[PDB]
Amino acid sequence: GQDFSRFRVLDMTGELGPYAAKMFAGLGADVIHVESPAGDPLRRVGPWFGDRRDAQASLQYLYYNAGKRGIAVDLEHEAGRTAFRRLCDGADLLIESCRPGWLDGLGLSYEVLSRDNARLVQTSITPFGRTGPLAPYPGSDLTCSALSGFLYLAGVDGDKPVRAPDNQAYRMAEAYAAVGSAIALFSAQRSGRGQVVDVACIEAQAMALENAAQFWDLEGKIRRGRGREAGSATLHPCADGFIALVAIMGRNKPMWTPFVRWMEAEGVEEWQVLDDDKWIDYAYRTSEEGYATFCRVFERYTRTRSKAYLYEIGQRFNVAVTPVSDGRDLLANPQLAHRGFWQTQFNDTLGANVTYPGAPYEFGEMQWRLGRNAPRLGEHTREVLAGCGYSASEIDNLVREGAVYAEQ
Amino acid sequence: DFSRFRVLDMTGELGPYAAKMFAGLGADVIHVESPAGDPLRRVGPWFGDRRDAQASLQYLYYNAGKRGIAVDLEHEAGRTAFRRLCDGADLLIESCRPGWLDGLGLSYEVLSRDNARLVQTSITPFGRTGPLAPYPGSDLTCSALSGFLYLAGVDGDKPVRAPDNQAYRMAEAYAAVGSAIALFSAQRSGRGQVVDVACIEAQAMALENAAQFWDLEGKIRRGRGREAGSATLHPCADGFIALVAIMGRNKPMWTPFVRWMEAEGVEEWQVLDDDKWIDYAYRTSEEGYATFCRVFERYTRTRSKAYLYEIGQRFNVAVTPVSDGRDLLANPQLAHRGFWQTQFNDTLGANVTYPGAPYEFGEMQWRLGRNAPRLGEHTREVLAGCGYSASEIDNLVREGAVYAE
Amino acid sequence: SVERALEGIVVCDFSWVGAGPIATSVLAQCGADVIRIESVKRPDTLRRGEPFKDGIGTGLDRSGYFAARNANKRDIALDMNHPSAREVAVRLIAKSDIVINNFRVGQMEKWKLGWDEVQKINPRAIYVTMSMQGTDGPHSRYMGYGVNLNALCGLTARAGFAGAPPFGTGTNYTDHVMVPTHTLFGIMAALLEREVTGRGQTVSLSQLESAISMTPSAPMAFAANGEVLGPQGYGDAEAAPHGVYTTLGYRKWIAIAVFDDAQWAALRRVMGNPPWAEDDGFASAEMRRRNAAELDERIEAWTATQYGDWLMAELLKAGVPAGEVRDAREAIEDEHLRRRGFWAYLDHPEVGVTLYNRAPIVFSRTPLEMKTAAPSIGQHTREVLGGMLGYSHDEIENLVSHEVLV
Amino acid sequence: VERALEGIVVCDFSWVGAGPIATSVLAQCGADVIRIESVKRPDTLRRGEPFKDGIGTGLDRSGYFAARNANKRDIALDMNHPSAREVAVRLIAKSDIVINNFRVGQMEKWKLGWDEVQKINPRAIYVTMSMQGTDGPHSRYMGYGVNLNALCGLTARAGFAGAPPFGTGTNYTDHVMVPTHTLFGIMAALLEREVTGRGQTVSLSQLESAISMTPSAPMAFAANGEVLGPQGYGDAEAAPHGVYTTLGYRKWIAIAVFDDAQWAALRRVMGNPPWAEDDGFASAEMRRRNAAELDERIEAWTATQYGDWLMAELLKAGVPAGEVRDAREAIEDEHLRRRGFWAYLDHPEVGVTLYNRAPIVFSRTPLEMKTAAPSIGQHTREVLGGMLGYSHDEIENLVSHEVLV
Ligand SMILES: *SCCNC(=O)CCNC(=O)[C@H](O)C(C)(C)COP(=O)(O)OP(=O)(O)OC[C@H]1O[C@@H](n2cnc3c(N)ncnc32)[C@H](O)[C@@H]1OP(=O)(O)O
Ligand SMILES: *SCCNC(=O)CCNC(=O)[C@H](O)C(C)(C)COP(=O)(O)OP(=O)(O)OC[C@H]1O[C@@H](n2cnc3c(N)ncnc32)[C@H](O)[C@@H]1OP(=O)(O)O
């Protein structure tokens, strides 16, 4: 057993960026969340812990910055930039979501930050990338999703699309930025040289077009969302919610007969309509008539039964059925309970327990952990600067000029 | 494991936890009902708005891990089948009215005529014998007569009931113990016996020291709750907490509590920094108890159960929340231990969550077992397992001696 | 020719205070040789807890709190932190079927007497431990007493009047039945297994989980329905009338519980068929529940004019569950518990003849026995060392002279 | 040309979704990814639309499959052939990473669990991916990306309030959430191996990877006890925030305003219409309160505009905006193309077709796109004779016995 403790990660992120550094913190890295004196903007978005709306009440902030210490530095101040450079001198990885050009314009380009630390990896997480026609311009979760092609797939026919929850434009970039960071870190261990890792939301989300790009390139077809191919990635209402069904794909034939087995065994009225080879071809499933009486037959039956019943009886008959789980279902999920996924940790700033999602992976030797409660603003400024060699007096003066902010 | 033991379980509202303990370690447990149905099926709390025969959460819990048959012992052919089942059983647990089985010609001597190892365990409000044996009892009335109920109050206040029929549960737990002791003995001697466990006696096991207070000092005690800081309950922001900051003259327990109050800046905490609190007579005095509650509850009323649990235990004080059902399902220690067992129920068409194992073994494995049976669900296969032909079973069903689903 | 169900079983009993001693007391009543290990320097706290014979709390052998949990046991006084004391325990463990302790975690390991060590001393030994709520986990180092477990397990929240502060049982209930019975069943399960495998095994209990297992409604109802199930005083969810009603005398109540229309007709009969009770607002179980408040008031107005023992007798003779709410004196003096032989009086060199009780099991062939009052610390040191463990007289004298023992 | 994963060798059993896209990233970093695919069980995506010109003949025309398998080698090993294990062992002995996304237990059927791989190669990193864990009541369940979208809580929160949920319209979980966590775990194990000299297991739950990127639904329920509902294309803080019609077929623009400065800039782009100056839109709180009317008024205006011109104007004024692009627009995007995200690769069957690199621009070890997706067994002989050291005669024998194709 070992861990990442030898790696120091500076994490200068806000609403965009922070899951990447959390992945490093989860395996034991020394992760320092770097905020401005005005505070990480993720502190000011919900959902919230109860009726609290203060700087420690954002559930997202608590989740994405658990496992990190926190400092506050003003890079618009020359002495703040000097301290930032001293921090980078000792870091293996800098992850940041600054507006393109800002650090360069402050005299903090990658070449400056790595002048006395050749191994340094700098990972930039931005809506559109550090370079290119869109790089000068602002983006948000919704607008990156629009421009990447991802948002358009969340609907059918002429319907406006819906958004994915939890800012997936940001999360996709952050997850790939964690990967890129780790690849560059591995390369740096072996070569002695770091580099810049440029991960754009618009590109990370273009990774999630499924096959929409190939539909255009190969067939001149514009696709939208799944949901209207009979029995193939369709959603169906039931007594207490919705289920998701994949009873047939492509031209791969095993999958349908078990679904008919299920309907017959349950006495579904009109089950015999489904016992027909008209259902095996991608053009018929997507036909008006194929889809409509699929739903008539299935939903007459599903509408009388619970999500858990269909999950059970469906997987019992070997049909790829899952419930459309809400938050209550997630916390009650007996598989996640068996796996100990939910992590509960008392928060001394809130004076309460907070329950978090847990480990996404397991290792033979490494240990995943949630880590320390997310930092208060400037909570660790003093000790982190002391760790870089700053005297108690130098820290006081840095606070005095406004170059850093330490909590009181 | 226990699969080699066959247990017949003829119980209702009273009785069923005992056989569940055997079922939990793998025994072959057969819940025996009358065709009219186990009365526990008709008691709540309930699964949602269902009130039918499979919707009693208690029935589902106490009879998980058992198969189910239905026999009418008022029928000679029902009695014949029951005797053949007993011929091959290691243990019969039952909660019949005293004298009923004997009066049907099903005394222990009959039931064990060709099965000398058989242990018969009777679970009754008052026992198989004695002046109360002819008479009915319930959880409340047994609790009253045992002395246990009276302790759930102070001074002239009427007492409150414990939840989940503890009169029955105490008898059932001790009857499981008695069953296992007699079974161990039978394994060694070749001879079973009758095991007679009465609710009134099992509950007198729970008088704490009330009987010795009378015998030794001529004192009648009631409940704890008014000795300052010693097994007292206190309101907090979202419920109540239970506190033991001192017992007897144990000042080492009190000092950490005083430090907790000081560290939290509790108003008047200095009142508690005094050796008078070490004196039981002062803790139970009107002014001592009132002053303790005044100082402590100013602080507790502003904090949640979860806060006080965390911080009190951080200061090495015995504090726990008065947990409700939501607190229990959210308890992170029970989550860590994997205590809650969730099993899909095909009759209800939904998942059901149950309490889990009450103990761990180095080699044996506890399990919840199969979903509680529907009425007569296994009547056919159990009777065939005893040597009855399908034709004989048909006649037993048609004459009403048994019920098969 | 007396037959004892646990003849020949030997228990190495490190346990003290609450749950553990109660469990081994039952084993001793079944014929097991229960050898309690107590240090004179650290005696069971209950030996200094009231009640005391005549209220005189001098010394360590006058408490009924301690005594009642320790009939029929032998007692050796070991200072287990002395190196030579460990060797004595090993000899005892080597002859013992059951090893039990309820120290806080790690204590047995300090003495190199964990299961790893015990299994090598005696592969037939059953090694029993318990903790408040498990040895690992976020709350595994927490502390609590029976009253704390009553609260933590969900019982106390549901033991009180609706809209009032909860009360609980008034006792450290978790330790008295829930924990000892599960402990005993686990021991017996392991003994049954050993009969076929020839090996002992570990038996471990979480007191919290034992308690929840006997109070399932609160967690099950919330898990199934999202409802917190509240307390209900002395009422019931199905029975009606069902409650505690004043009768004549000081703090006198009678419990009455009616579960069907026949029992209601019987109660009306015993009350003399008053017209008020003939109302159809009480004719069905569901109407009696809906009108429970009025019904309880009308019942109590009548019961308060009656003697409770006479009323209880008449109700039981009419098939109606009824019981006077008895104090401990009434339970001690009960004709029924005494005819059952539940109470037992044992002589003691210090306090004389005092009250004990057997466990609540009447075995028809191997009855429980009550033979000796609770022992003094080290009462049987020399007898056990020389009789069972094979030490010579000089080695015994040397062990006790050094203060290793007695 | 410097490559970040130079010299790394991957024994790649993975197929369909998640696994293949993960190893595609490794191959773009210079790793030698040797995919094991049998003619007996071809990747289901090879038979899935879209196909070159809509002609789905054979197994090498699908863009569904191809886009996930650029830059890989492919050996056609029938792992159920008795002689196949010996070939796989030779490869594992040369591999840094062994990876599969079969259902639980499949590798063990071939005696290629971790226990055996660690003995073949103590430096190998043994990567497994399950739907939701190797053990547990649901560990034998199966599903696709759309199923995990639903099970992980995403789909319930991806829809219009009061309407059936929709999800993403894709098998989303497989495309980013699972492969990225897989890759990070792989890299963590490789970093550790640099210090310890040992490989280790990396095991992922796809369900738990997905929940880890959608924390609000479980966190909001666990903390506040209420289900957080879907919100269409709105936002909890931004205002205005939505999707608005512009001129053309199924044309929309996304506009998202996060402070008063951006609202003033949006008003100016709109020509400062009197309605937008109202006190009901002056603060973020009022714009949220009046969101329905605000959205209606904005859409009335955007519907008169060309979306690309409007987007350019808004972005130039500092207002987040983006046309809702279809896949053709993403392919033809000046930005993604100048970034080099799209890559066209020649293929002996389908000619030059569209691929893309992973979304990472390395300044010193850039990703490379070199070869189109392979055919089944394209590199069988090359790998057997080159890396695994089989003689010419042994290869011919292996092929005659149909161990490989
Ligand atoms: S039924 C519900 C009751 N609750 C629980 O059982 C859960 C645990 N919670 C508690 O509150 C403790 O169990 C209580 C009841 C407070 C017991 O407190 P102790 O601190 O006294 O007991 P420990 O197990 O924690 O430590 C044992 C200490 O006693 C000394 N000791 C015991 N026996 C001997 C012998 N024979 N010889 C010498 N010393 C002995 C141990 O050395 C030890 O003292 P330390 O100060 O810890 O070294
Ligand atoms: S992104 C969502 C994709 N799903 C996952 O990632 C989850 C993990 N895996 C799965 O859920 C299943 O793999 C899916 C894709 C859902 C369904 O796959 P199957 O049930 O059909 O296949 P199995 O994983 O159960 O077992 C593999 C079977 O395919 C045969 N096989 C694979 N590779 C070979 C080779 N090289 N040679 C011969 N046969 C091969 C396997 O033998 C096995 O077939 P059997 O007939 O069962 O032996």
Please estimate the helix content of chain C: 25-40%
Largest pleated sheet of chain C: 6 strands, parallel
- Listing every helix as H and every strand as E from the N terminus to the C terminus, the arrangement of chain C reads EHEHEHEHHEHHEHHEEHHHHEHHEEEHH
CATH fold call of the largest domain in chain C: Rossmann fold
Number of helical segments of chain C? Answer: 17
Number of extended strands of chain A: 12
Specify the structural class of chain A: alpha/beta
Number of helices of chain A: 17
**What would CATH call the homologous superfamily of the largest domain in chain C?**
Crotonobetainyl-coa:carnitine coa-transferase, domain 1
Pfam family, one (chain C): CoA_transf_3
Keywords (chain C): Transferase
Organism (chain C): Aromatoleum aromaticum (strain DSM 19018 / LMG 30748 / EbN1) (Azoarcus sp. (strain EbN1))
Protein name (chain C): Subunit of Benzylsuccinate CoA-transferase
Describe the structure.
The complex is a heterotetramer, with two copies of chain A and two copies of chain C. Chain A folds into two domains: 8-208 and 339-401, Rossmann fold (3-Layer(aba) Sandwich), CATH 3.40.50.10540; 232-328, 2-Layer Sandwich (formyl-coa transferase, domain 3). Chain A has 17 helices and twelve strands. In chain A, helix 1 (18-26) packs across helix 7 (168-191). In chain A, 36% of the residues lie in helices and 15% in strands. A six-stranded parallel β-sheet of chain A has the order 3-2-1-4-5-6, with helices on both faces. A three-stranded antiparallel β-sheet of chain A has the order 7-8-9. Chain A has 408 residues and is an alpha/beta fold. In chain A, a hairpin with a 4-residue loop joins strand 10 (343-347) and strand 11 (352-356). In chain C, helix 1 (19-29) crosses helix 7. A six-stranded parallel β-sheet of chain C has the order 3-2-1-4-5-6, sandwiched between helices. In chain C, strands 7-8-9 form a three-stranded antiparallel β-sheet, with helices on one face. Chain C has helices at 19-29, 64-67, 83-95, 107-110, 115-121, 146-152, 178-197, 207-213, 217-225, 261-270, 285-290, 292-303, 308-317, 328-332, 335-339, 381-388, 393-401, and strands at 10-13, 33-38, 74-77, 98-100, 126-131, 202-206, 242-246, 253-257, 322-324, 343-346, 354-357, 362-363. Chain C folds into two domains: 10-214 and 338-401, 3-Layer(aba) Sandwich (Rossmann fold); 242-332, formyl-coa transferase, domain 3. By secondary structure, chain C is α/β, with parallel strands linked by helices. Chain C is 36% helix and 13% strand. Chain C contains 17 helices and twelve strands. Classes of the chains: A alpha/beta (408), C alpha/beta (406). Chains in contact: A-B, A-C, A-D, B-C. Chains A and D meet through helix 2, helix 6, helix 7, strand 6 and helix 8 of A and helix 2, helix 6, helix 7, strand 6 and helix 8 of D. The complex binds coenzyme A (2 copies). One coenzyme A is lined by residues 16-18, 36, 38, 40-41, 77-80, 101-103, 106, 129-131, 142, 144-145, 174, 178, 206 of chain D. One coenzyme A binds next to strand 5 of chain D. It is classed as transferase. Keywords: CoA transferase, toluene degradation, transferase.
